[PDB]
Structure 1
Amino acid sequence: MEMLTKFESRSSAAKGVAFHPTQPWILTSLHNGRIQLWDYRMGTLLDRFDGHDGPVRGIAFHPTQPLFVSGGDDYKVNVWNYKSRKLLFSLCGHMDYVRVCTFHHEYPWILSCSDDQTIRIWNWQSRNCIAILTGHSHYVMCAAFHPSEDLIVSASLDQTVRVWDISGLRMTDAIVKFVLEGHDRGVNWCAFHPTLPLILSAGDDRLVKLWRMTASKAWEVDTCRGHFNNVSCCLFHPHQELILSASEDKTIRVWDLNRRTAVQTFRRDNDRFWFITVHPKLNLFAAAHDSGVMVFKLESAWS
């Protein structure tokens, strides 16, 4: 495959990137504590947001509201209105670095996870913490809402990937359903497939593991082997049978979803990769690395 780069930013190390679902924008959250809002079709910096001290690793748009949420090493989860350009409020409660923060697609909820070993669910309408998910015995490096079920998946340096049942909170509020074992070192990332009952996880063991799950059970399907340093991030290609991973070995790797064989490796000479994301509708990906952010299309070779 080939990488068609549509936009690159040169900046302090990027930790997070978020695609706007309808506008041609990305938010970037940087090691220096700043959040950039870019138009990647025009190549223009639309806005800058100062609300954190230290790196900002969590960043996400609300799918419909004029909001985005940021999470920082200063423990704060900040909710912003990007139309009025105001910091609406800070959700305090986490006692260590925040690694991820996202909005739910239906309920007025924010999800965050932290080095303090907890996942927190907040109601951004009431500004209250409505659930604290405990059980992990080390940093929770990632957590994600399921796109169609009342489930959360989380990844921790305790070497486990947890799938939680949050049906109770939707109506005990949260109960661990699966404690997935298999990674031999800490797990840095976890992801759901947008329509298939699959889970991706990636960790310091250099492995990207593919899991499948039913309502009653789960199993490891296979492992993508090849990265030669910590894997920072992984995701499903939404519109193709492909897996993508990003690693401190300075590569983004594309893998066959059906066979978990290597399809294509992209390298950067000097930049470790910290994060990758995909647009919910378009063949559009973003990667965050030591020197900034890149937005690109993934195309078949000599297309």
Structure 2
Amino acid sequence: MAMLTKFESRSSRAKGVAFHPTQPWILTSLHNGRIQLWDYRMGTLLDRFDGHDGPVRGIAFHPTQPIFVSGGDDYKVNVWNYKSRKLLFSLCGHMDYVRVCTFHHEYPWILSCSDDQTIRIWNWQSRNCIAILTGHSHYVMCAAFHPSEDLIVSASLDQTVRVWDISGLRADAIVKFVLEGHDRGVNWCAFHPTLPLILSAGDDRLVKLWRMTASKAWEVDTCRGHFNNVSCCLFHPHQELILSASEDKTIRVWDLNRRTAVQTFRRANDRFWFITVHPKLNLFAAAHDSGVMVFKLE
């Protein structure tokens, strides 16, 4: 498998990247607190957004509205309009670093999670927190909405992945499954677009695959090969492949069915912090210690 890099920014450490679903843009959020908006077809910086002190780890566009959300070490979840370029409002509630923030695909909700050991769901019309999901015993490093069902999945340094039932919201927001398996903290978790599969990545240097049904969830298999903390992982949406990204300075591609290594891509000096896939193109982006890259595979 070959990597074809289409865009690269040279900057201080980047922590988050988000693809716009129809414009050729990415947002990048940096460890220095700044947010950039780049056109990856022209290769040019379009806008800068400054509304945080310290690192900004969470960043996401709304899937249809001209909004994006950012989440910071200053505990704020900020909502912005990219046409007016204004910071619209700041959602107050978290009491420690925000690790991830995303929009729901249908409801007017934002999800965020935090070192304060909570996941929060916010309604961006009323500007209120509508649920606080508690139960993790350490930082919650990641949370994601299920692509169709009223479920959330989260990953924590308490070494667990949890799946939450939020149908009551839509107790009420309650843990459905507590997935034990990682023997170290978990840094990331992700749902497959269509199948009942979860992927998680941890400080044990492993990527694990899990399967769920209505009544139960269990560990399927493990991708072994990273030699440092795995920061992020995702399902390739158009091939039976798993992608992972690690502080060992590699992006790895694995076979979804066999869990065997397919390809490794390596940078000489840069730890990887985050990877994402475009919602409608076969385009990927990674954030690392020296900026961001957008790339195709094969």
How does the TM-score come out when normalised to structure 1?
A: 0.98
Measured in 1, the distance between the counterparts of 2:165 and 2:159 equals 20
Structure 2 partner of 1:95: 95
Unaligned runs of 5+ in 2: none
Q: Deviations over 1:46-92 (max 9, x none)?
A: 00000000000000000001000000000000000000000000001
Q: Deviations over 1:157-202 (max 9, x none)?
A: 00000000000000x1201000000000000000000111100000
Measured in 2, the distance between the counterparts of 1:44 and 1:217 equals 48
Unaligned runs of 5+ in 1: none
Q: Deviations over 1:233-286 (max 9, x none)?
A: 000000000000000000000000010000000000000000000001111000
Structure 2 partner of 1:202: 201
Which structure 2 residues correspond to residues 245-260 of structure 1 after superposition, within 5 A?
A: 245-260=244-259
- Per-residue deviation at 1:149? 0.2
Structure 2 partner of 1:279: 278
- Per-residue deviation at 1:4? 0.4
- Per-residue deviation at 1:219? 1.2
- Per-residue deviation at 1:217? 1.1
Measured in 2, the distance between the counterparts of 1:129 and 1:260 equals 39
Secondary structure at the counterpart of residue 45 of structure 1: strand
Measured in 1, the distance between the counterparts of 2:10 and 2:297 equals 21
Secondary structure at the counterpart of residue 100 of structure 1: strand
Measured in 2, the distance between the counterparts of 1:298 and 1:236 equals 14
Measured in 2, the distance between the counterparts of 1:165 and 1:267 equals 38
- Per-residue deviation at 1:14? 0.4
Measured in 1, the distance between the counterparts of 2:281 and 2:87 equals 29
Measured in 2, the distance between the counterparts of 1:89 and 1:22 equals 24
Measured in 1, the distance between the counterparts of 2:213 and 2:259 equals 21
Which structure 2 residues correspond to residues 136-175 of structure 1 after superposition, within 5 A?
A: 136-170=136-170, 172-175=171-174
- Per-residue deviation at 1:218? 1.0
- Per-residue deviation at 1:109? 0.2
- Per-residue deviation at 1:216? 1.4
Structure 2 partner of 1:185: 184
Structure 1 partner of 2:106: 106
- Per-residue deviation at 1:110? 0.3
Secondary structure at the counterpart of residue 168 of structure 1: coil
Measured in 1, the distance between the counterparts of 2:40 and 2:14 equals 16
Q: Percent identity?
A: 98
Measured in 1, the distance between the counterparts of 2:193 and 2:29 equals 24
- Per-residue deviation at 1:15? 0.1
Measured in 1, the distance between the counterparts of 2:289 and 2:84 equals 31
- Per-residue deviation at 1:214? 1.1
Secondary structure at the counterpart of residue 265 of structure 1: strand
Measured in 2, the distance between the counterparts of 1:135 and 1:175 equals 9
Secondary structure at the counterpart of residue 167 of structure 1: coil
Query: Displaced runs of 4+ in structure 1, greater than 6 A?
Result: none
- The number of equivalent residue pairs is 298
How does the TM-score come out when normalised to structure 2?
A: 1.00
Q: RMSD across aligned C-alpha pairs, in angstroms?
A: 0.4
Measured in 2, the distance between the counterparts of 1:27 and 1:214 equals 35
Structure 2 partner of 1:130: 130
Measured in 2, the distance between the counterparts of 1:195 and 1:282 equals 17
- Per-residue deviation at 1:117? 0.1
Measured in 2, the distance between the counterparts of 1:279 and 1:211 equals 23
Q: Deviations over 1:142-164 (max 9, x none)?
A: 00000000000000000000000
- Per-residue deviation at 1:108? 0.3
Measured in 2, the distance between the counterparts of 1:215 and 1:236 equals 21
Measured in 2, the distance between the counterparts of 1:38 and 1:49 equals 12
- Per-residue deviation at 1:127? 0.3
Measured in 2, the distance between the counterparts of 1:117 and 1:64 equals 30
Measured in 2, the distance between the counterparts of 1:57 and 1:277 equals 14
Q: Deviations over 1:73-120 (max 9, x none)?
A: 000000000000000000011000000000001000000000000000
Structure 2 partner of 1:225: 224
Measured in 2, the distance between the counterparts of 1:12 and 1:177 equals 40
Measured in 2, the distance between the counterparts of 1:42 and 1:239 equals 26
